[PDB]
Amino acid sequence: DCSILELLKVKNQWREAFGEGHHRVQFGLELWKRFFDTHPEVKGLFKGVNGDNIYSPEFAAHAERVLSGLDMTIGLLDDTNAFKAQVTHLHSQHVERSINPEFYEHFLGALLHVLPKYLGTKLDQDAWTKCFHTIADGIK
Ligand code: HEM
């Protein structure tokens, strides 16, 4: 359901607050704070990156890596084969970590909760939901 109209919207909007430096840092931080707040239990999966301390340089690194992966896939939504190559790589990086697949819905929930702060009233939740599910399907 992530078709040309949706994927173009999500591209424009993602960059309309995909930034650099501190702007970027604060974003990932608010995303993971919201996620860890709504689902405390998920933190057990992040001990390798110091999930119990989201202000540590280590978890901050992780957060930034996640936004980059997001940036990479979102950018490849209109390029089927390039997209496939990258998510398959993301799949490899999530596959032996025993991630309960419902967690992806909650990650989406967090992301939609924090995006209004950088997009205001313009956030297109439908387009975002459809295209995120394409990405998550790939990762799973
Ligand atoms: C679109 C959604 C997501 C994207 C783009 C994404 C992206 C990434 C990226 C880029 C890494 C770094 C991998 C590396 O360099 O080794 C990573 C690691 C990881 N992700 Fe995700 N991720 C997503 C969703 C999730 C969700 C929903 C969970 C769990 C509920 C999760 C759990 C993990 C874990 C446990 C790691 C490894 C942490 C470690 O290094 O110990 N991810 N992810």
How buried is residue 12: exposed, middle or buried, by Cβ count under 10 Å (0-12/13-18/19+)? exposed
How buried is residue 107: exposed, middle or buried, by Cβ count under 10 Å (0-12/13-18/19+)? buried
Length in residues, the chain? 140
Query: What is the atom index within ligand 1 of the atom nearest the CA of 65?
Result: 10
* Candidate of 72, 91, 94 to mutate for ligand 1, largest count of ligand atoms within 8 Å of Cβ: 94
Tell me which method was used to determine the 3D structure.
X-ray
Please state, as a whole number, how many other Cβ atoms lie within 10 Å of the Cβ of residue 62: 19
Instruction: Find the 94 Cα to ligand 1 centroid distance in Å.
Output: 6
Q: What angle do CA 6, 12, 14 make, to 5 degrees?
A: 95
1-140 sits in which CATH class? mainly alpha
All structural domains of the chain with their residue ranges: 1-140
User: Which contiguous run of DSSP H or E holds residue 61?
Assistant: helix 57-75
Query: What is the atom index within ligand 1 of the atom nearest the CA of 132?
Result: 1
- Alpha carbon 126 to chain centroid, angstroms: 16
Instruction: Find the 46 Cα to ligand 1 centroid distance in Å.
Output: 9
* Candidate of 31, 45, 66, 139 to mutate for ligand 1, largest count of ligand atoms within 8 Å of Cβ: 66
97: Cβ contacts below 8 Å, ≥ 6 apart: 45
